[PDB]
Amino acid sequence: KRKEFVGKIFNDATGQTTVICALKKYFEELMSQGIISEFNVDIDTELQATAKADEFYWKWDAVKVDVMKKIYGTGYL
Amino acid sequence: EIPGFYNRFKTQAEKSTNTGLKGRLAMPIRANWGDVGKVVTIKNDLRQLKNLFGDDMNYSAFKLGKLALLGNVKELLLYRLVDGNQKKGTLTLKDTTENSAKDVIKLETKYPTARNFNVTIKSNLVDSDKKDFIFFENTKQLFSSSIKGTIDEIVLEINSNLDNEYVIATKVADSDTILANVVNQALEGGNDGCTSITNESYLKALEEFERYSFDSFVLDGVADEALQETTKAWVAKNKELGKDILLFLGGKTEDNIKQINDKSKSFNDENIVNVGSSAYYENIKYTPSEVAVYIAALSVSKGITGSICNAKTIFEEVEPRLSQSEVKECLKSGTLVLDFDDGDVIIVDDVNTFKKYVDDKNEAMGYISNIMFINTINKDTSLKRKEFVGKIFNDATGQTTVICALKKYFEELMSQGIISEFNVDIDTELQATAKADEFYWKWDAVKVDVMKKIYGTGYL
């Protein structure tokens, strides 16, 4: 995505929104595959406040879907 | 392939099948004949046992194998026990063309043994250069052959026909000279298999047996105590490692019923079954462990959908013989003992050594059939491990799929009637505490019982 967004959109609210929307679409594609159980992606307003005008900061959390490695069963008769 | 109409006929087992067999059993054995140092599976035809380990009843191998096969096990797994000195028989042949005769062929038994496998070589009466090679065991002829006086063709023919499977021929030298005549010369240098067999050999055999999976183990029909504790610990380890192996044992012939009951008290793990009674089948006695082989074989052949509490035995006599007081004493002790309730010898009950204790491991656990059921459920579940572990994502869909598969399995069990009632569900108590990469689940069931006791009251 660097080449899609770097040097091609103006760092205004519109450009930031477009970048966030594209990343959200990608993560929602991942969600549709079920790989991720939960996620959120948002602007890193903490670092964006300190960001220079020609740069952008963003944050995202996710939860990869696990797999059974261990399984335990208990029986009653 | 090229165009055409190419038939490939497959009438190999059209209706040559029957379903009267089940189960598999482990067997450390002492044998005069057969393979050494490997765990070999034997199909229930005793001819296979006779071929692959001989027909000598002086050895644990053939006798306990026959008992197990009469127990109707689907596949009997054997292991020949030996001391390191145990050896193959051997014989050497020499030429006669040269005055300084040179060894040119050596004959060695195909399997380690000490039996008197004998060989004869004589001048061929038809062809001048041919020698008639004949093979015996104590003069009982196995195979005869005739080859011209070149060593390569001689050894190739002797190794070619499977009628000569008892012995292997190897070339000592590349001679084209006339062989020396021998008459019933035994393949000496071999050693038997009953030579200095100790607990270490059994330990090695058990370590070999760790590879495989079994329905029961019986320990060679030998009642040596230290071997019994060793096998007890070994089975406990196997259970903790997810291998659900059942063990049958038999006390010494010298032990009184009190001593047998004391030993059956000493054993209290559910996978331990102690056998007290001795028996005769072909007018030949069998120690409690030798018949423990047969009872384990019959139990595994029964599988699920059956029991042993009144299964008829092949034995023509049983001893020592018990009144109802003695029978009740033995059952309370957890001992399993045969009985003569009718003109045949009949198994008294389904009990195991655990039965001395009651409540936590329930009274049904005191019966062998319940243990076989639980081990089977554990085995099928531990088969499902590979289907489900590391292959589905722990989401609600994966949990539902696992639960649905287990429900289908238990419903298959219900269709067979083995279970009267069951439910299987997620263990939400432990699932709440479960780590994200694991799953917990619970199930209740009710195995269908069998009449052991019946009572009738009459009115006239």
Task: Give the separation between CA A18 and CA B68, rounded to whole angstroms.
Answer: 77
Task: Give the separation between CA A41 and CA A60, rounded to whole angstroms.
Answer: 4
d(CA B426, nearest CA chain A) in Å:
10
Q: Quick one: DSSP state of residue A73? A: E
Q: Is A6 on the interface with B (CB under 8 A)?
A: no
Q: Which residue type does B92 have?
A: T
Nearest CA in chain A to B375: A75
B315 contacts B272 by C-beta, under 8 angstroms: no
Q: Is B391 on the interface with A (CB under 8 A)?
A: yes
Taking the CA atoms of residue B358, residue B359, residue B364 and residue B365 in that order, the dihedral angle to the nearest 10 degrees is -80
d(CA A62, nearest CA chain B) in Å:
14
Contacts of B426 in chain A (CB under 8 A): none
Q: Is B359 on the interface with A (CB under 8 A)?
A: no
Q: How many residues does chain A have?
A: 77
> Tokens for B295?
């009872």
Phi, psi torsion values for B121, nearest 5 degrees: -130, 130
Q: Which of B18, B14, B56, B15 is nearest to B34 (CA)?
A: B56
B438 contacts A72 by C-beta, under 8 angstroms: yes
Q: Which of B22, B67, B25 is nearest to B306 (CA)?
A: B22
User: For residues B339-355, b (16+ Cβ closer than 10 Å) or e, as one string?
Assistant: bbeeeebbbbbbbbbbb
Stretch 15-54 of chain A: residues touching chain B, C-beta under 8 Å: 34, 37
Which resolution in angstroms does this entry have?
A: 4.1
Neighbours of B28 (CB within 10 A): 29
Phi, psi torsion values for B440, nearest 5 degrees: -125, 145
d(CA B214, nearest CA chain A) in Å:
22
Mapped onto helix, strand or coil, the DSSP state of residue B303 is coil
Are A67 and B394 inside 8 Å of each other by CB? yes
Q: Which of B251, B303, B301, B305 is nearest to B276 (CA)?
A: B251
Instruction: Report how this structure was experimentally obtained.
Output: cryo-EM
